[PDB]
Amino acid sequence: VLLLDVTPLSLGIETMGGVMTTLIAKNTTIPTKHSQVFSTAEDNQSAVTIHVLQGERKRAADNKSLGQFNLDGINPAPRGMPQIEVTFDIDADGILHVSAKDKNSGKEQKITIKASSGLNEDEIQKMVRDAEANAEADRKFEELVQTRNQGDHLLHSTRKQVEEAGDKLPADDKTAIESALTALETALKGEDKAAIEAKMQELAQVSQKLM
């Protein structure tokens, strides 16, 4: 064939820390269907937001928003335990169906996105050029968010481990840990990946007693 229908830009959702995660790559022939399992960002999370995006940027904010919906009623559990199946299905007419289903509860929510939605030809070409001109920066952003999410998860895990230990943790140890948790919390608000990792290292250096 010399011609066929494609979806012109990548399609996906916003994940923890403002990153776009792709479900359907740009230029995929349509009709197409792809599913991916996601989970919760923190412990005891009973609801997730499914924000549908079109574009090639790593920051969710830089892509075209196609719509959003919430999935509620997830049983509060440790982070990473829920299995949230997200499906993107584009039919032959270019109509996009997005669904999210929590495997444990059976709870499901969906949205239908019209084929006329998203970016036009000129905006598509600008999107592609802007992504290539910002490839290094977008990569650094993505690496920064992965570190931030690890740091955020370390902050929560340490805090829970401290309370679970309680009296067994010596005074001098507990104070050094609380001070390093504050230094990590501050570093997480910045955009320097190595500064966050160094604060995670300093926290680990004062946390041997909890281990």
Place this chain on the structure above:
Amino acid sequence: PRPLPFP
């Protein structure tokens, strides 16, 4: 699995 934001 990748994490999702909460409402």
